[PDB]
């Protein structure tokens, strides 16, 4: 009924400021209100503020006071939110929030932006293979290591092998780099006849790796 | 500020069986004009945005499953999940809306209890490939278990490692209620080289004692 389409990825480094856009279309163009919640890894959603587009009203959670600047602009129904003073701890996904009448649904979401705050280059992974060596079943995988920002996505076979497949989320190294491991699980009888292929794609390096993984 | 406190963090429920979330308030949220309670839930899974359910405390939002319900009494509110299906597996945060700064719960995760399942666990050793690069990954894989706490410990040469590994765990499997969890041993390849046996100790309450998965170098 409502789409809030957000700005793109973002990669800042620390001490820097970020600026992230809503679009609203679908219903009204000037008087709601539009707010910002934003979780980090690991933690709870957290409320940043409100701002009405039509008066430019504005009202920031206490610990963004000073930090934060909402503005908007009634004529492309676009509401933005300006974070400076960057850390780590703003590495998070932004939410904004348009808050409707009575009669229908009383909120709408968007989809979220990612805001990576950190030191690290862009970079693209290496990809391993984890070679299947258990029960009638063998794992076999592939390791998706240093690469910078997040994320990635691997496939198996083009997306056409689903059944038994685990990707995990990814872990920070102390060196700023991402590492990932995707695995599945096939019957043994299997290595033999079929061919297991790892489908990675890290966008932001515009690197996209094929990876065969077979019995050593 | 309007704190909201959660409970319980975490829940296990069998499916169709009753779950029930905590959230209680600092201060009332009560407005005296209309003797609504400015509480809302949220419903968060992956691949979507935090999802409203219940506004005013008991008010189900359009397209909510009438098994879910809200209650408030005074500083307290509570969510009820009648009869629990697997897609209702997510975080849950209560809201308050009275004053003009919102403040959410700090959440609280629902899963499925399933029975006890015990771990099937894989060792992998460093890729040739990545030897080349003077550093080595060691993979260890725990498969399809339930609960989620289990203890990876990594030995080289019967050294336990501490501080040098790094896991993850999927969410919850639609189909089985299992996780699965992937441990990462990183290493110097001179290190790698040097010690001879690389073993994965796995501990967790499916397993009798703790299972053992290892490998020699170079075999
Ligand atoms: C409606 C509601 O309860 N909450 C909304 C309301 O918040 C108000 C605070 O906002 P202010 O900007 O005013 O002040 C900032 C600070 O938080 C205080 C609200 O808490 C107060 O208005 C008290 O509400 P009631 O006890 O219902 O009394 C109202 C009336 O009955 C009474 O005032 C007399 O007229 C009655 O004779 O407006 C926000 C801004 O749009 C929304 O975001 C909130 O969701
Ligand atoms: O096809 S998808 O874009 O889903 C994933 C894509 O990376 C697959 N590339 C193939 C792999 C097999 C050899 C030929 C190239």
């Known amino acids: 009924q409502v789409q809030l389409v957000q700005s793109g990825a973002e990669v800042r480094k620390p001490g820097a400021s970020v600026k992230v856009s809503c679009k609203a279309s679908?219903?009204?163009?000037?008087?709601?209100?539009m707010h910002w919640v934003r979780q980090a890894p690991g933690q709870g959603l957290e409320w940043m503020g409100w701002?009405?587009?039509?008066?430019?009203?504005?009202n920031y959670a206490q610990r963004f006071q000073g930090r934060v600047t909402m503005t908007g602009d009634t004529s492309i129904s676009a509401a933005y939110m300006d974070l400076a003073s960057l850390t780590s701890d703003d590495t998070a996904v932004y939410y904004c929030?348009?808050?409707?009448?009575?009669?229908?649904?009383?909120?709408?979401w968007g989809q979220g932006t990612t805001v990576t705050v950190s030191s690290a280059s862009t970079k693209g992974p290496s990809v391993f293979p984890l070679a299947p060596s258990s029960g009638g079943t063998a794992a076999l995988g592939c390791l998706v290591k240093d690469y910078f920002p997040e994320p990635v996505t691997v496939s198996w076979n083009s997306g056409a092998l689903t059944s038994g497949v685990h990707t995990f989320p990814a872990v920070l190294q102390s060196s700023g780099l991402y590492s990932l491991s995707s695995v599945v699980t096939v019957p043994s009888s299997s290595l033999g006849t079929q061919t297991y292929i790892c489908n990675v794609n890290h966008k932001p390096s515009n690197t996209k790796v094929d990876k065969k993984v077979e019995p050593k | 500020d309007i704190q909201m406190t959660q409970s319980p963090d975490s829940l296990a429920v069998s499916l169709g069986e009753r779950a029930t979330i905590n959230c209680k308030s600092s201060?009332?949220?009560?407005?005296?004009?209309?003797?609504?309670?400015?509480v809302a839930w949220y419903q968060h899974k992956p691949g979507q945005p935090p999802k409203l359910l219940i506004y005013?405390?008991?008010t189900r939002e359009f397209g909510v499953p009438d098994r879910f319900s809200g209650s408030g009494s005074g500083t307290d509110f509570t969510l009820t999940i009648n009869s629990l299906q697997a897609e209702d597996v997510a975080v849950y945060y209560c809201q308050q809306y009275y004053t003009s700064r919102r403040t959410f719960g700090q959440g609280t995760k629902v899963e499925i209890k399933r029975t006890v399942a015990a771990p099937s666990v894989f060792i992998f050793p460093p890729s040739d490939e990545q030897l080349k690069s003077g550093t080595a990954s060691v993979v260890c894989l725990l498969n399809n278990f339930y609960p989620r706490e289990a203890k990876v410990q990594w030995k080289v040469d019967n050294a336990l490692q501490s501080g040098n590994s790094q896991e993850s765990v999927t969410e919850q499997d639609s189909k089985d209620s299992t996780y699965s969890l992937s441990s990462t041993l990183t290493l110097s390849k001179a290190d790698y080289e040097k010690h001879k046996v690389y073993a994965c100790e796995v501990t967790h309450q499916g397993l009798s004692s703790p299972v053992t998965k290892s490998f020699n170098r170079g075999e």
């Open positions: 201060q009332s949220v009560l407005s005296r004009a209309n003797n609504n309670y400015y």
């Open positions: 005013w405390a008991s």
């Open positions: 929030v348009k808050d409707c009448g009575s009669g229908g649904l009383r909120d709408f």
């Open positions: 679908g219903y009204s163009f000037t008087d709601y209100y």
């Open positions: 701002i009405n587009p039509k008066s430019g009203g504005t």
